[PDB]
């Protein structure tokens, strides 16, 4: 009622203030408080609330101390029953950066982002495609210092934390970035995004190649996703240096 409803009593001009913050800092004890924790962070009515003030932009920092206090210490504060919020809330920090301490707070949370995977290896097929997927989708963002970090840290996620053998590599290519490039129709997208996409996904291809746990599908496939976005800037280049890798790491195993 008080928070969601009565929207014109409390605003950004109040909790702008030292008694929002002060509000807002008492209001984070009841999670890390042992009473009402539980119940807190079930609720979806609390996260909707935490998703509205974090386009506060006096009060993003203090979410985001919140969240790297509370995620560090105790692994069993997310759960399938609260993760999208969470993973939706992040989201929303690091888009904030449109305009440094923004920038500054972004290139925080992108990490931060990318290290919601050692602390709990028990996930969900849907659990952990959602990081991946905020990942790809951060790579849009038009401020060049935000997104040529947000890449690389998406290449640092992908080189040495997910484990293979109960996913695969089919469903990591096709259920993760692929879902950028169909969406990718629109012009204004243009040859920059998807170029920096085919970048990575050549790379991460070369690294698990180089360590081998593919087959032919995976090449046909990955095939078919360079011929379904012909291009003759990008694909006579790429083309060409996979077929080169490939024959390379081939010569890497046999002797």
């Given at each position: 009622?008080?928070?969601?409803?009565?929207?014109?009593?409390?605003?950004?001009?109040?909790?702008?203030?030292?008694?929002?913050?002060?509000?807002?800092?008492?209001?984070?004890?009841?999670?890390?408080?042992?009473?009402?924790?539980?119940?807190?962070?079930?609720?979806?009515?609390?996260?909707?609330?935490?998703?509205?003030?974090?386009?506060?932009?006096?009060?993003?920092?203090?979410?985001?101390?919140?969240?790297?206090?509370?995620?560090?210490?105790?692994?069993?504060?997310?759960?399938?029953?609260?993760?999208?919020?969470?993973?939706?809330?992040?989201?929303?920090?690091?888009?904030?950066?449109?305009?440094?301490?923004?920038?500054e707070l972004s290139l925080?949370?992108?990490?931060?982002?990318?290290?919601?995977?050692?602390?709990?290896?028990?996930?969900?097929?849907?659990?952990?495609?959602?990081?991946?997927?905020?990942?790809?989708?951060?790579?849009?963002?038009?401020?060049?210092?935000?997104?040529?970090?947000?890449?690389?840290?998406?290449?640092?996620?992908?080189?040495?934390?997910?484990?293979?053998?109960?996913?695969?590599?089919?469903?990591?290519?096709?259920?993760?970035?692929?879902?950028?490039?169909?969406?990718?129709?629109?012009?204004?997208?243009?040859?920059?995004?998807?170029?920096?996409?085919?970048?990575?996904?050549?790379?991460?291809?070369?690294?698990?190649?180089?360590?081998?746990?593919?087959?032919?599908?995976?090449?046909?496939?990955?095939?078919?996703?360079?011929?379904?976005?012909?291009?003759?800037?990008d694909i006579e280049k790429?083309?060409?240096?996979?077929?080169?890798?490939?024959?390379?790491?081939?010569?890497?195993?046999?002797?």
């Amino acid at each position: 009622d008080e928070l969601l409803k009565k929207g014109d009593i409390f605003t950004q001009k109040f909790f702008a203030t030292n008694q929002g913050k002060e509000f807002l800092k008492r209001l984070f004890s009841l999670t890390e408080s042992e009473f009402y924790r539980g119940f807190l962070l079930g609720n979806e009515n609390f996260w909707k609330f935490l998703r509205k003030v974090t386009a506060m932009k006096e009060q993003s920092e203090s979410i985001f101390e919140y969240l790297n206090e509370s995620i560090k210490t105790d692994s069993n504060i997310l759960t399938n029953e609260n993760f999208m919020w969470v993973l939706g809330l992040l989201d929303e920090i690091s888009s904030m950066g449109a305009v440094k301490k923004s920038i500054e707070l972004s290139l925080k949370s992108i990490q931060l982002t990318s290290h919601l995977l050692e602390d709990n290896n028990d996930l969900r097929k849907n659990e952990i495609f959602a990081i991946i997927q905020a990942l790809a989708h951060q790579c849009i963002n038009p401020c060049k210092q935000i997104s040529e970090f947000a890449v690389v840290t998406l290449e640092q996620t992908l080189i040495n934390k997910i484990e293979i053998p109960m996913e695969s590599v089919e469903e990591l290519i096709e259920g993760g970035l692929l879902p950028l490039l169909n969406s990718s129709e629109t012009q204004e997208d243009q040859k920059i995004l998807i170029s920096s996409i085919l970048t990575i996904i050549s790379n991460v291809y070369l690294h698990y190649l180089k360590l081998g746990k593919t087959s032919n599908e995976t090449f046909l496939k990955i095939l078919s996703i360079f011929n379904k976005f012909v291009e003759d800037s990008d694909i006579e280049k790429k083309l060409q240096q996979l077929i080169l890798d490939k024959k390379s790491i081939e010569k890497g195993n046999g002797s």
